[PDB]
Design a protein around this ligand. Structure first.
Ligand SMILES: OC[C@H]1O[C@](O)(CO)[C@@H](O)[C@@H]1O
Ligand SMILES: OC[C@H]1O[C@](O)(CO)[C@@H](O)[C@@H]1O
Lengths: 488, 488
């Protein structure tokens, strides 16, 4: 219902009273998250510039502050000591120049000679509203102040369409590389385009990374290369991916692909996995960004929200949030994702659990529930439930002969993008034990399965009084329930 | 230099781009606090509505978001689990009605039947810009949403001037009371006016609290009654207080007065102390608010900033911050002030200290330094220092025969309200040991002396590279230095 004209009106054409009212409405929503990054107002999308710089972790965010829609985008900035306690540093990059006149689109951050380079796509729209994507390298100093150049680092080559964006800038084997999401103009196929530079001034196009003969959709958004336990891992968003390659149920998937080896000079990838896999088996994860931190870990964080989708909170004039930070690991040829050790510092009021059918009559809105469930069982765990278990988030489990987890949000509250289904299923090994580490925060749930072998992340909109946690049947398990303190 | 017209322009007449730019400028200031409450933009003053409600601590703030000046005021809202980790809930009360058309001035919060009543002064200005102060009772619900009535609870009586504000609403001995700061129309003397109600609907004026025959200045701002270890304690701001009653060096003082007994029905106070005393011996504390929490403690928090004063950060378009929360105690007939136990959770990188002249060559911008210094010594402790100790915050101590502490900020950076002096002195007991617990955060320093017997709080603006901590001479002492994590 918001027209193009309304979405692209400049921030200076909105009044400040409207913005202050929107900040109040977002912060005081009964569906707001209070230990995950969320918008101060309006809509949040893709994580950007995820980095370590000047003694702390940095994270930037795609932002449209005036409503629950993809209006003209800016970067906002947060920092933290520990990947958990974030503090807001305000807007960072505005759509205020010719290069970015219709948005400061997504990008990355790389430390260089005591500064943090912020490489992003300028979403230019010309006199005729034709999109011309520019790749821009801005610079942030040790006081978090940003300067932007007058000229693009990379102009769009003739062989890509208008879709050519989301640069990842990094240093590898003494050279600089940029990975970009690209649509080939002739085939309309999705690719990761590689550029290289010795000096950050002149860029050479090495060409599309060779990901085999099968198409990766019609566009790749938010490509990332991170090294995890010495393996090159791609994390990327192939819009229109053929489900023959990999099943997924969300409108657009967020995949990962582990390589044995990558050669960015020759645009070669040697796959470890025969096929890419879903990063997240849940309902709402997109635009994951990852980076290699100086502690020797690779960290990722996800937009919880999908393009071209709607949510029940739209009428409250704000949208979406982030996942918690995930530390990455490769084990047994698969990507594992772990909560960072600092998130334990939010825990309070520990309860020990042993075989209790009702875990809590009323658990509050922010908790962590960690369970060890025996093999050979079937049943349902209800979270954010009413008393009679008819309205809840359901985790339907079987650890017996047809083992699997089905997460069902149909009865949890109002419908959420129901054209893409109200259930998500994760196969499990027959007759094996099951670990769950479940984080609830307002209208966000993150389920870490079998110590991070799988992660299911989703929005859900339960009535405020629906806080019960219970199994439907007597279940053999041990675990702990903690409240999680508000920090945001 | 900001005219009346500019200060009173409605928030809707500012553009949102200006507000977003101001949020960035405030948050990224190299003088910003990162573990104390600070404005998201513009100017912060008096703490308001300090309370416990709906499972958490609440604090509201006088705010003018558009610059470093006392423009037309609103309340903003923060909450926390622990009086340390605050999260922003946005604007709460706007100057958007006839009752508060020229400001939502200060006030208090009292829980009532599952709601939080917010009692505040409406700063009305009529057709002729004549001030008419109204006392208004607004109501907040369990989702932090506020409704405001159409009519005032208390209209200004004929015997007070236009200065009649800052209501403290509370329940005591089964009745409701309101304490207001008042200027008598005939004498132009400062008073605390007492109102009482059985139902919160009809208010009866009990009259000025009898604080003896000596005048308490020309106006009392921000009056508070809190019960501390069963003593009634007044905390208040008597503008124009005669220094014959008590020495103070700040433009306007923030005093406290312990009573043996108070009778709010008869407007009687029985003093324990012969005279009121300074709450804070430093350079910048004003408008302290306190309340009795359900854990049985009394807690206070202070505006760090003074009316009618200027600061070096004014050119960065933001102003001021809060103190940390202080837990109150009465000991030996004096008010002691203690950090809350939760602030220890910010500590990291502990260093043990024993007699070292140089504590740190470079301590960072956020730390806690706790020292035990032997009796019989004299010297200077330099904080936020250059290498040669010529530019620093100085704590000049003597624990020998003329014992005292002098805090000197003259060489720390640019001048700060120098008409009110660059030193503050606290007498100490001759030939006694000295405890200091010093918190540095950006441009804020809080010095807790002798386990909270005195507190000195000040702004200071050191060069970013001035981070040395050192004694000028060999000094006998033990202590600890911790870094303090950013949370805001
Ligand atoms: O907000 C704009 C950004 O969002 C995406 O469409 C993915 O969600 C990116 O390709 C683009 O940079
Ligand atoms: O911001 C307005 C408030 O500030 C004071 O002048 C004290 O600093 C109060 O008496 C008034 O309510």
């Amino acid at each position: 219902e918001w027209t193009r004209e309304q979405r692209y009106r400049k921030y200076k054409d909105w009044d400040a009273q409207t913005l202050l009212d929107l900040q109040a409405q977002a912060a005081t929503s009964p569906y707001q998250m209070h230990y995950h990054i969320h918008p101060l107002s309006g809509l949040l999308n893709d994580p950007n510039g995820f980095s370590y710089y000047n003694g702390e972790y940095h994270l930037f965010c795609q932002s449209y502050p005036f409503g629950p829609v993809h209006g003209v985008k800016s970067w906002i900035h947060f920092a933290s000591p520990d990947l958990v306690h974030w503090h807001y540093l305000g807007p960072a990059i505005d759509p205020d120049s010719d290069l970015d006149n219709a948005g400061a689109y997504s990008g990355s951050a790389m430390e260089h000679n005591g500064k943090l380079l912020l490489m992003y796509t300028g979403n230019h729209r010309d006199e005729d509203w034709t999109r011309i994507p520019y790749q821009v390298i801005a610079e942030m100093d040790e006081n978090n102040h940003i300067t932007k150049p007058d000229a693009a680092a990379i102009l769009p080559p003739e062989h890509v369409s208008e879709h050519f964006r989301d640069p990842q800038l990094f240093k590898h084997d003494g050279k600089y590389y940029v990975l970009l999401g690209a649509q080939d103009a002739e085939t309309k196929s999705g690719h990761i385009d590689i550029y290289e530079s010795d000096d950050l001034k002149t860029w050479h196009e090495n060409g599309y990374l060779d990901l085999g003969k099968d198409e990766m959709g019609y566009m790749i958004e938010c490509p990332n290369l991170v090294f995890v336990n010495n393996y090159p891992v791609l994390i990327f968003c192939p819009q229109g991916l053929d489900k023959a390659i990999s099943d997924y149920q969300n409108i657009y998937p967020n995949m990962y692909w582990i390589g044995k080896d990558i050669n960015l000079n020759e645009a070669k990838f040697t796959p470890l996995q025969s096929h890419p896999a879903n990063l997240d088996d849940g309902f709402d994860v997109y635009a994951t960004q990852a980076f290699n931190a100086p502690d020797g870990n690779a960290y990722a964080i996800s937009w919880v929200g999908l393009p071209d989708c709607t949510y029940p909170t739209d009428k409250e004039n704000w949208a979406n949030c982030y996942s918690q930070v995930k530390r990455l690991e490769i084990k047994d040829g698969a990507l594992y994702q772990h909560p960072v050790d600092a998130i334990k510092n939010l825990r309070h009021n520990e309860t020990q659990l042993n075989d209790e059918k009702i875990i809590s009559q009323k658990a509050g809105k922010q908790y962590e529930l960690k369970l060890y469930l025996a093999a050979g069982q079937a049943g349902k765990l209800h979270l954010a439930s009413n008393d009679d278990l008819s309205a809840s988030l359901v985790i339907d489990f079987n650890t017996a002969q047809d083992a699997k987890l089905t997460i069902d949000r149909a009865s949890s509250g109002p419908a959420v993008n129901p054209d893409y289904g109200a259930t998500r299923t994760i196969g499990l090994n027959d007759n094996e034990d099951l670990d769950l580490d479940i984080f609830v925060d307002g209208s966000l749930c993150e389920i870490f399965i079998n110590d991070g072998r799988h992660v299911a992340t989703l929005r859900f909109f339960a009535r405020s009084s629906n806080q019960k946690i219970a199994f439907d049947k007597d279940t053999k398990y041990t675990g702990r329930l903690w409240s999680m303190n508000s920090i945001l």
